[PDB]
Motif scaffolding. Structure first.
Motif, mmCIF file in Angstrom:
data_model
loop_
_atom_site.group_PDB
_atom_site.id
_atom_site.type_symbol
_atom_site.label_atom_id
_atom_site.label_comp_id
_atom_site.label_asym_id
_atom_site.label_seq_id
_atom_site.Cartn_x
_atom_site.Cartn_y
_atom_site.Cartn_z
ATOM 1 N N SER A 62 -13.819 -3.375 -0.391
ATOM 2 C CA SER A 62 -13.909 -2.985 1.029
ATOM 3 C C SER A 62 -13.046 -3.949 1.857
ATOM 4 O O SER A 62 -12.353 -3.504 2.754
ATOM 5 C CB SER A 62 -15.358 -2.970 1.466
ATOM 6 N N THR A 86 -6.659 9.243 4.807
ATOM 7 C CA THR A 86 -5.926 7.949 4.700
ATOM 8 C C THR A 86 -4.449 8.155 5.055
ATOM 9 O O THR A 86 -3.906 7.357 5.868
ATOM 10 C CB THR A 86 -6.061 7.306 3.313
ATOM 11 N N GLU A 111 -14.728 1.442 3.734
ATOM 12 C CA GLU A 111 -14.746 0.541 4.899
ATOM 13 C C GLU A 111 -15.867 -0.473 4.791
ATOM 14 O O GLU A 111 -17.014 -0.099 4.618
ATOM 15 C CB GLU A 111 -14.948 1.348 6.177
ATOM 16 N N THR A 147 -5.909 0.285 0.129
ATOM 17 C CA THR A 147 -7.184 1.034 0.088
ATOM 18 C C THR A 147 -7.344 1.812 -1.226
ATOM 19 O O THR A 147 -8.318 2.577 -1.368
ATOM 20 C CB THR A 147 -7.296 2.015 1.270
ATOM 21 N N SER A 188 -9.296 -3.244 2.630
ATOM 22 C CA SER A 188 -8.941 -2.325 3.753
ATOM 23 C C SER A 188 -8.394 -3.144 4.924
ATOM 24 O O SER A 188 -7.576 -2.625 5.733
ATOM 25 C CB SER A 188 -10.097 -1.529 4.148
ATOM 26 N N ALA A 199 -9.306 4.186 5.981
ATOM 27 C CA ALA A 199 -9.660 3.851 4.571
ATOM 28 C C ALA A 199 -10.834 4.693 4.108
ATOM 29 O O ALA A 199 -11.739 4.903 4.873
ATOM 30 C CB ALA A 199 -9.977 2.361 4.451
ATOM 31 N N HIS A 207 0.831 -1.227 0.000
ATOM 32 C CA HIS A 207 0.000 0.000 0.000
ATOM 33 C C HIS A 207 0.857 1.265 0.000
ATOM 34 O O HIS A 207 0.303 2.381 -0.321
ATOM 35 C CB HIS A 207 -0.932 0.103 1.207
#
Lengths: 729, 729
Positions: free
Chosen positions: B400, B486, B495, B408, B403, B492, B375
């Motif tokens: 979702s 974020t 979510e 994200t 996350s 995130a 990420h």
């Protein structure tokens, strides 16, 4: 011994002509100690032949050639040919390889199983050989874990052909016989995952009495202990050793009340979270195990640990036993991990069974299967089956097949444990099977909707359930006698057909059919009824001979495979001409041994029955129409004699002989009555009912009655009518 | 640190009360260096307790007991009990074993996936614990691969219970925060695997403008470089670094034209065949890497090699960057093999993200997921999904759930990548989801038939697609503000429901439903419409509180699970009473930051919204009916206020406060209008339409209107009518 041969790094022990131990040792030392599986390697001397060369050895018995070519054991260096022709090219065992033919054994549990699951191999094979690997730890003389065997490979080659009963007897000689059960184990058990109070549990036990349902065992499931009252910082309330005082304010008084009703009492034990700091026994256990009480150090579950086991038996179970707990339901579902490599379930069953003998003679546990030899720790507890027709349809096959690894006391949750679907007929069929199973323990899930109480159901289902629950207690004399035969002679109560009929292909094709002791053959119905007939059915294989429905007297000429139909309230159970079945005449009467026995005799042949009891042996003989009863010891017991249909003698004391050559041999069962009943209940057209009744009454020749039913458009109705015509032939 | 404990060959670091590092070292040295996953082990000091004995150690925090019994790490020697009761007997972690409860994370790619695929575990569990193994290489101080860790086992035990947001924040502290995206990333991207010319690509960008579709990004796929023109002795044209001069005779001038239209430009890079002797950069790369040019030695792809990476960035990418390429689309599909054992995809994302920061601030890549910690290198590129309803139906849940491993910024090919089936409604539903996803990048396969241009479709689909594409640009202020949240707070944008509602069973039973920033709750429709209703549907869980359809104002009283129906042009998106959503008033206007913001207020409660921007913070507060806007810095920005239905203030400059207690709270949405519209579009009998309209208008009592619809023979029509009655209750 002359029965021992060493070659290269291997050792062979010819235990029987059909059983050879095969060992490998890197160190030149071989293992003499017992293992988790093996209790005894003392066997009588047998003859065999050896061909020993520089590089190879061949051991020859009546049934097998075992070959070892030296070096490490591989599929090439170690292998055996059986001296049988049951297959064209499946007659060779290769080390480390599987062959066809294994008739299977059992598995740990039916937890989460909806219908079938895979089973482990047993010692029985259609091809005549099986290998049983001993991968367990060694035991000390007194039965503690001593560590790793010095026989780093230790195998038992069974080459019994299709002599399955001898294979099982010799397996029991190797692994130890099943202990005798106590008589209380063979009666009805009540159980429910339900938050009863002392008051509501006694009220229910008193309602069973009012409803004429006899019970031997009162199970109290996990809501006996704290559950929601456990602070979440400790984890769940699944494990518990502390009475919920709201529900059980005076536990010893509550257990005294169950004891006054002649019930034995067992509590659910979920051992996996050990003894945590909120528990009533924690201060004593913490002192014994030197725990840090200000940091609330748990006594974690550790059955490898001698001090933990002692504190568990003496300081955790001990206080509950003092309150009157008779035996332990070990409900272990938390895996196979321990530091020793011994399955914690095996450590629990082995040590808890041994500990249970301190307080009561011939005591039991209730726990899941822990591998070969764990039959030494009855009873088996199959667990969390899914409530389904599919689960019931697996369960008879499951139960009889377990005899193939000697595990002959499975207790299933009768009616299924959890999830699944409501169907009162499934519940009734399941109870019929349970009554003709090793143990009849009613149990269910935490649902408000899954009680196995008969009066949960409609008046028809209720009466039939009460009838079968009474029958279980009528059968206790027969069951207890078979129990002593398991313990002393190594014969299973429940046998697959192929034990008695090993050379009959049809004995391998009726998976749910079994022998139940020596005098009864059971074919439970495990499929929902056909609504057009209002009857369920099963294909029954009748061996050679004359057979009778145990309940109706309907006759069947073997050998034949025949679909049989029964109403939901009726179960297919059969006895041969000459069968003698004892029954308790007073199944509701609380008494240690029956004051009165019914001798139920099936005419047409000689027979005999030996009723083994705690303090007596009673022999019933039926020879050239003369029925004789004698016993080792005298008693005030009163004998009733039922010859086919008719009660011949009522409540006669002591030894005696009565001549039944004079008496009516034939049962009342008749074609016309049974025909009328099948047509009457069927949900078919009245014109079809009228035509069938008229034509089958008018047509005289048996072959033409069969031709008449052969034209019927309803194929299952044809098969039902064919059953009646076959019995009436 | 006092947060470090050594025992036998293990090291334990208590990072938080709920996060423990567990290490094993044969050599007595433990690893302090960063890894591919872990960037930071500096955490504030926390309290815990230890029970240390001769042979065992127990570490005790507020949420976990970690046990280590010495020796090598096994399932017996290393294990942990959580101090929670979310399960009955799934509260124990065993080293090397899986437990139930993991809520999952993500996977590398959706390449070739038609519907669902398996996901890897994340750090979130319903049972309150997860282990994240660090199996990566160590990094140097500047972020090159340094080789193998000296902690040969290195694990992170997360024992956060159901505090999922804190678990994710602390994961970002361990692995590094997600960097800030640039605002251009959050607008619409155009992409197509299609051999555009400079002229035809600009014509299409000018057609978007004419059609009122705003774009932020121009993707040029692989036909930018030579493909069919590559001699076959070199292999395929999949990898390329040389402009096709027929299509792009003056690349810098073409990129200058996209820059004049305020587009950012990215090229597809297929790196796997490296730099072969036909390529325009090959002579320079051959000189740098000492290649044998007369044998046409390729510069093979080798991202383990420092000189290769330098030549790739400076001599292969560098010239294309000079022509104006803004960032790199890394499209890697050629496996996980390298000499180092580091996945080449990880080496590409890590080094290319770092290299992209040289030319532009807060720059991005576009590449597949490269495991936990990746990420740090946004954006995610899921790849070659199959064009299907099944693929769309998986994608919200996929997005979702990601996350849960902190990944994200997934960019999916909106409308699906390849294969599959044509259905304009699938394309429209997919774009609705994409608009409410992390990134809205339209992309497709090499087919002549798979363009995502709105005007590919009929006038109804076209207008709805244009409407949603405009909405994406209206949402950029909200998205950019969530982006900075974020980067700075580790929250995130997307979510799962269970982040906000961890103790609500229904938050785990609506897999495609999610929070989108803090003010919106989205329930995309991912099933083909019911042709009888001319509407699609999804079951929505409404949490406690009053909810409004974001578009219509239709109200819903939580808590309830309710099937909602929408026409193909409409999407279920909901806001609570008190919600404040900023919107760009001028989404088509090319400008770095909005000159005008609409404040969209949902009546019925207080609320607030903090609009974070590159150079400002603007706070909107709604308290006791007073709406206030203030900012760190002044600007010429004009604010529009929409209170429910009504525009209250138009284009007002600077800070201000307006009282809305006076103004109309209620939206126009009304039962009768919505009822008429649902009946009117339905493909049902006119007599049924007439009877429903008449009876629902006449019947006064709500309970009797519901009884009336309960008799309807059309079960789905009942559910549609029930939604309107529930909203009108």
């Amino acid at each position: 011994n002359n029965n021992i041969i060493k070659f290269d790094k291997a050792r062979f022990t010819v235990l029987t002509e059909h059983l050879i131990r095969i060992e490998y040792s890197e160190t030149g030392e071989f293992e003499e100690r017992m293992t988790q599986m093996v209790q005894n390697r003392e066997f009588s001397e047998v003859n065999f032949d050896i061909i020993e060369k520089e590089e190879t050895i061949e051991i020859i018995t009546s049934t097998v050639h075992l070959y070892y070519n030296g070096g490490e054991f591989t599929n090439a260096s170690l292998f055996a040919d059986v001296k049988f022709n049951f297959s064209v090219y499946s007659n060779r065992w290769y080390f480390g390889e599987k062959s066809d033919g294994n008739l299977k054994g059992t598995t740990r549990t039916l937890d989460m199983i909806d219908g079938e699951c895979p089973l482990e191999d047993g010692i029985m094979s259609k091809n005549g050989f099986a290998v049983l690997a001993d991968k367990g730890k060694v035991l000390t003389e007194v039965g503690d874990i001593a560590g790793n065997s010095v026989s780093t490979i230790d195998l038992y080659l069974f080459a019994y052909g299709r002599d399955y009963r001898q294979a099982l007897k010799d397996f029991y000689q190797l692994t130890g016989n099943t202990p005798k059960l106590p008589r209380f184990a063979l009666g009805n058990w009540w159980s429910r995952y339900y938050d009863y109070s002392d008051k509501s549990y006694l009220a229910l036990m008193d309602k069973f009495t009012d409803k004429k349902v006899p019970l031997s065992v009162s199970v109290i499931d996990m809501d006996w202990h704290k559950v929601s009252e456990v602070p979440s910082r400790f984890g769940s309330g699944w494990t518990g050793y502390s009475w919920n005082k709201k529900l059980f304010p005076n536990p010893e008084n509550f257990i005294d009340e169950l004891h006054q009703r002649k019930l034995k009492v067992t509590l659910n034990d979920h051992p996996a979270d050990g003894i945590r700091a909120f528990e009533d026994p924690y201060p004593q256990v913490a002192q014994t195990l030197d725990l840090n009480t200000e940091l609330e150090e748990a006594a974690k579950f550790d059955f490898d640990n001698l001090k933990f086991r002692k504190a568990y038996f003496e300081e955790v179970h001990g206080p509950l036993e003092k309150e009157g707990v008779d035996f332990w339901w070990i409900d272990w579902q938390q895996g196979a991990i321990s530091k020793s490599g011994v399955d914690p379930l095996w450590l629990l069953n082995h040590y808890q069974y041994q500990n249970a003998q301190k307080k009561h003679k011939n005591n039991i546990i209730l726990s899941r299967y822990a591998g070969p030899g764990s039959h030494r720790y009855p009873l088996g507890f199959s667990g969390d089956s899914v409530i389904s027709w599919a689960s019931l349809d697996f369960q008879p096959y499951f139960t009889s097949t377990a005899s193939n690894i000697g595990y002959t006391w499975w207790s299933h949750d009768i009616g299924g444990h959890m999830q699944g679907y409501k169907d009162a007929e499934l519940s009734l069929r399941w109870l019929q099977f349970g009554v003709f199973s090793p143990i009849n323990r009613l149990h269910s899930s935490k649902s408000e909707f899954t009680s196995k109480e008969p009066w949960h159901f409609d008046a028809v289902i209720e009466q039939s359930m009460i009838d079968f629950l009474q029958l279980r207690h009528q059968l206790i004399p027969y069951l207890y006698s078979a129990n002593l035969i398991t313990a002393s002679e190594g014969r299973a109560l429940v046998e697959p057909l192929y034990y008695e009929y090993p050379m009959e292909e049809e004995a391998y094709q009726h998976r749910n059919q079994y022998l139940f002791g020596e005098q009864l053959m059971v074919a439970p119905i495990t499929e929902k009824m056909n609504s057009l007939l209002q009857m369920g059915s099963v294909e029954v294989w009748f061996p050679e001979g004359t057979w009778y429905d145990f309940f109706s007297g309907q006759p069947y000429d073997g050998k034949v495979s025949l679909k049989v139909y029964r109403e939901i309230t009726e179960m297919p159970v059969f006895a041969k001409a000459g069968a003698i079945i004892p029954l308790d005449k007073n199944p509701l009467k609380k008494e240690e041994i029956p004051s009165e026995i019914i001798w139920k005799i099936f005419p047409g042949a000689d027979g005999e029955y030996l009723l083994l009891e705690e303090d007596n042996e009673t022999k019933a003989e039926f020879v050239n129409g003369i029925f004789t009863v004698t016993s080792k010891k005298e008693s005030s017991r009163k004998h009733t004699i039922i010859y086919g249909e008719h009660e011949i003698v009522s409540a006669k004391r002591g030894e005696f002989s009565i001549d039944l050559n004079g008496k009516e041999e034939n049962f009342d069962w008749n074609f016309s009555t049974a025909l009328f009943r099948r047509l009457d209940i069927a949900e078919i057209s009245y014109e079809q009912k009228d035509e069938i009744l008229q034509q089958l009454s008018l047509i005289e020749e048996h072959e033409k009655q069969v031709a008449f039913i052969k034209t019927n458009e309803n194929q299952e109705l044809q098969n039902s009518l064919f059953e009646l015509l076959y019995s009436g032939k």
